[PDB]
Ligand binder design. Structure first.
Ligand SMILES: Nc1ncnc2[nH]cnc12
Ligand SMILES: Nc1ncnc2[nH]cnc12
Lengths: 205, 199
């Protein structure tokens, strides 16, 4: 698309979202998201294509932000969290001798740390899978919260060398349309991230 | 590069790891290494296809081959893929049919375009997990792999047809011979292409 890119303090940011349901009025003020589709395969295919188009066009983003909703039985409902680490729960190679969650012939740990921490936002570990998690298990999930996209976004970003930052509001898992609150709290978090970008969020030392 | 030309039609062979690729296959083609699992496959193939599209070029067919598990079909035999489903997809709690991706218009089971004479056919299920023992019971497809559905969506995104091929490694009530049988299947497929299968 390339018209969906937002420039903040000389840096180019790309926001990606799964479905239009999560995209509300408050977020609409901040940016225009690339619609990434639903699930790990849709997310991986769509984002890898977009990033490949942008790279060969020299149009590459400095930061990709994956944001949307998530479920949790652990975390307070209707609160926004930044993703500290992500894992892929659909991946089990254990019958052949691999630790659960680890992908063969790929040097990555089972839990992949995301590079960034923005002040003023809670952190949470995330699990990505093609299933919507409900009721029990849950207790089969080690991560704090669950989504269908982020890990697929990560592998796409790592493939082209762009860093990734996640943001997730909790829409369910205590037992929906609460997205109105999710959209407002997510916009508040986005404001803090863009400020952090201006403050040098992308930089070593 | 890794693409093979047959009768003026361009074929791209993709596999997960070294694995199922032996001497008999080596003589026929040099496969793209697509990685293991639906996420690795989708990212790597979408990237490769995007590089090939803007440089197009582009393939007229993508051949996804490698091993598969089955609790149903005989071991050490090769099957072309009649259809493919994504077993990790469950949207049912919010009302979608189990195995169906929201906002995509596709059935839970997606038929593949081509059938080649002289080769057994089977349905395929893909997911990030290795299916073993008791886990086979809830799987409706004849056999299971970790890649092909990801390949399918990657191919569909750029508008290229896909052909699956699978040897049975495990489950399989009663990797050496599989390499020989996949090679025999590939040969029949290439001949099939020379006969106008890609019309
Ligand atoms: N329960 C859930 N499981 C997976 N992804 C989700 N996104 C929002 N709620 C979810
Ligand atoms: N048993 C198995 N389960 C899943 N994918 C496979 N690919 C080959 N064998 C497999």
């Amino acid at each position: 698309q390339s018209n969906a890119m937002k420039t903040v303090a000389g840096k180019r940011l790309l926001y990606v979202m799964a479905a239009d349901a999560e995209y509300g009025r408050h977020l609409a003020k901040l940016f225009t998201p690339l619609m990434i589709g639903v699930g790990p395969v849709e997310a991986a295919v769509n984002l890898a294509s977009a990033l490949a188009h942008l790279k060969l066009a020299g149009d590459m983003p400095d930061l990709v932000i994956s944001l949307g909703s998530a479920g949790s039985a652990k975390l307070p409902q209707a609160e926004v969290y930044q993703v500290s680490s992500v894992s892929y729960r659909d991946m089990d190679a254990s019958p052949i001798g691999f630790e659960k969650g680890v992908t063969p012939f790929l040097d990555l740990p089972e839990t992949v740390e995301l590079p960034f921490r923005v002040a003023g936002i809670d952190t949470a570990s995330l699990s990505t899978g093609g299933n919507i998690v409900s009721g029990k298990a849950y207790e089969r999930i080690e991560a704090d919260m669950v989504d269908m996209e982020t890990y697929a976004c990560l592998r796409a970003c790592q493939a082209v060398g762009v860093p990734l930052l996640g943001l997730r509001g909790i829409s369910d898992g205590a037992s929906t349309q609460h997205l109105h609150v999710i959209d407002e709290k997510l916009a508040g978090a986005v404001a803090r991230v863009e400020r952090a970008v201006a403050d040098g969020l992308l930089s070593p030392s």
